[PDB]
Design a protein around this ligand. Structure first.
Ligand code: MG
Length: 384
C-alpha cells in the first residue's frame, strides 16, 4: 500500500570487500525478509521497500555519484551505507536533504550529525572498551597502534585511544603505518618495527585482511604480544587467516553476537529464517551478515514507529525523529539496547569480546565497557 525507496551502498569488490560482501548479503536478506513478512506503520498501512543496491568499491568519488543518483533519480528517504570517509563527507548533505543514513561506519564524528545513525557504539568507545578489557584482564602495559594513516576509517578512534590510554593504565609506545591493502611484506615490516619496542598489546584499526596478516606476522617474527582488533578486523575466518601462531593471543571486538554464540538469540534465529526463505545456506550466515541485517532492521523498526501520513509527508525526517524517540531491541543481537539522543546519537557503550582460543576455536569472553568517566566519543568529536 506504501512503497518507499531506500539506497544500499556497499563495497563488494573493493579494499573492504573482505567484510563488505557479507554485510551486503545480510542487508539484502533483511530487505527481502521484512518485505515478505510484512512491514506495517503504526496505523496498519503496509510498507514495501524498493531498495537500490550499488557497489561503490570504497571509492569516494563513486560514493558521491551514487548518493546523487539515490536522491535525484530515486528520491530515497533512507540509505543503508558503508565507509567512514564517504559517510562523513555526506553527513552534512544528508541533513540538508533529510535522508536517514544508517552506516556500517561507526565513526564518532557522526554522532552529532542529525540524520546519521548506527546500531553500535562509535569506534572510539568500542576501542576503549576493548582496551579496558585488555588492561583489566592482563594488566597495565605497553601498547602499539597499527593503522593506515591515510584512511579515515583506520584513523577514526586513534586520537581517543591516545587520550584515554593513560587513564586505562596503557602506555602508547608508537604508531605504525599498516596499509589497508597491506601485503604480507608490509605486515612483517610493521611487526618487526613493533618488535623493537616490545609492546605487551597491539591495536589494529584495519579490516580483517591486514589485521590477520599482522597477527600471523607477529607470531612469525617472534613478537609475543596480544592483538586486539576493531570489529571489522576479526570474525569467524580469523583462526584460519591468522593460523596456529596466533592461537590464544588475538581478540576481536563486536557490538553484535556472532551466530555461533547465538543459537538461542531471537535475532540470530530471525536471520536464519531469512536465509532459509531465500535459499542461502546456513554456513553462509556470519557476523558480517548480522551487521548488514541489523542496519536494515533498525530502519524497519523506525518505519513501524511512524504513521503512514508522517512517512508520506516528511519521509526521512519522520524516520529520523522515530529513531530519536524510541528504545530499540534487535532480537537481542546487540550488546545493549539502542537509544538515541537528539544531538548525540550514541546507541549504547558496551561490546562483546571474542578470543581466538588456544585450541584455535573462537571463545566468547563476555560484555565489556570502558570506564564511565572516559568520554571516548566526545574526544573524537572535538578533534581539530
Ligand atoms: Mg532516544
Amino acid at each position: 500500500s506504501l512503497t518507499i525507496n531506500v539506497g544500499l551502498l556497499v563495497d563488494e569488490t573493493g579494499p573492504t570487500s573482505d567484510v563488505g560482501k557479507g554485510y551486503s548479503l545480510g542487508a539484502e536478506l533483511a530487505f527481502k525478509y521484512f518485505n515478505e513478512k510484512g512491514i506495517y506503520t503504526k496505523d496498519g498501512v503496509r510498507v514495501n521497500i524498493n531498495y537500490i543496491k550499488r557497489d561503490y568499491a570504497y571509492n569516494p568519488t563513486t560514493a558521491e555519484e551514487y548518493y546523487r543518483e539515490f536522491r535525484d533519480r530515486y528520491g530515497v528517504i533512507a540509505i543503508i551505507g558503508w565507509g567512514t570517509a564517504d559517510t562523513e563527507k555526506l553527513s552534512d548533505q544528508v541533513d540538508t536533504d533529510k535522508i536517514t543514513y544508517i552506516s556500517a561506519s561507526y565513526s564518532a564524528k557522526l554522532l552529532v550529525k542529525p540524520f546519521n545513525f548506527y546500531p553500535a557504539p562509535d569506534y572510539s568507545t568500542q576501542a576503549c572498551s576493548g582496551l579496558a578489557f585488555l588492561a583489566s584482564e592482563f594488566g597495565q602495559g605497553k601498547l602499539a597502534l597499527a593503522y593506515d594513516s591515510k584512511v579515515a576509517y583506520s584513523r577514526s578512534p586513534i586520537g581517543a585511544i591516545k587520550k584515554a590510554a593513560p587513564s586505562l593504565g596503557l602506555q602508547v609506545v608508537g604508531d605504525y603505518d599498516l596499509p589497508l591493502r597491506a601485503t604480507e611484506a608490509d605486515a612483517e615490516r610493521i611487526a618487526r618495527e613493533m618488535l623493537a619496542a616490545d609492546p605487551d598489546y597491539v591495536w589494529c584499526g584495519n579490516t580483517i585482511s591486514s589485521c590477520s596478516l599482522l597477527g600471523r606476522a607477529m607470531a612469525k617474527v617472534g613478537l609475543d604480544a596480544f592483538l586486539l582488533t576493531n570489529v571489522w578486523g576479526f570474525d569467524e575466518r580469523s583462526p584460519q587467516l591468522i593460523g596456529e601462531g596466533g592461537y590464544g593471543k588475538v581478540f576481536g571486538i563486536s557490538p553484535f553476537i556472532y551466530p555461533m554464540f547465538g543459537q538461542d538469540v531471537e535475532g540470530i534465529q530471525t536471520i536464519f529464517e531469512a536465509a532459509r526463505m531465500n535459499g542461502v545456506s546456513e554456513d553462509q550466515i556470519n557476523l558480517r551478515v548480522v551487521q548488514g541485517f541489523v542496519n536494515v532492521w533498525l530502519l524497519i523498526k523506525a518505519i513501524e514507529s511512524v504513521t503512514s501520513q508522517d512517512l508520506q509527508e516528511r519521509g526521512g525526517e519522520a524516520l529520523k525523529e522515530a529513531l530519536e524517540a524510541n528504545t530499540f531491541d534487535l532480537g537481542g543481537i546487540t550488546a545493549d539496547t539502542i537509544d538515541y539522543e537528539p544531538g548525540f546519537h550514541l546507541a549504547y557503550r558496551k561490546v562483546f569480546i571474542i578470543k581466538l582460543g588456544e585450541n584455535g576455536e573462537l571463545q566468547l569472553m563476555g560484555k565489556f565497557e570502558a570506564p564511565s568517566q572516559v568520554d571516548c566519543a566526545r574526544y573524537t568529536i572535538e578533534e581539530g
